[PDB]
Design a protein around this ligand. Sequence first.
Ligand code: NAG
Ligand code: NAG
Lengths: 50, 41
Amino acid sequence: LPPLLTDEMIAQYTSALLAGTITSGWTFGAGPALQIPFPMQMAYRFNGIG
Amino acid sequence: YQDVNCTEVPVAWRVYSTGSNVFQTRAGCLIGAEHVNNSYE
Ligand SMILES: *[C@@H]1O[C@H](CO)[C@@H](O)[C@H](O)[C@H]1NC(C)=O
Ligand SMILES: *[C@@H]1O[C@H](CO)[C@@H](O)[C@H](O)[C@H]1NC(C)=O
């Protein structure tokens, strides 16, 4: 039997996740996606490890 | 009908073997449903 999800939609989901985590930080896992420039989220990701 | 090129589906209830609505997909052949360009859930 063929798979229910062809590879194209799998690639679409992966691209969606990647774009979301690049642009909106991790705030798109909780609620609405909140925009933030990339350097200031790497700054907070440092601030999260001391 | 699974994995059957439906040029010969009724060769081997008749209403569900005629050509009222025939769709060809990767899974097999679908009879009784209308193809639609629109996309839904
Ligand atoms: C299915 O059968 C038809 C015969 O009408 C043939 O032309 C075609 O190549 C076959 N395979 C398909 C449609 O994938
Ligand atoms: C769907 O799109 C195709 C390609 O443009 C067209 O031939 C067809 O008439 C459209 N409508 C249906 C119901 O298939």
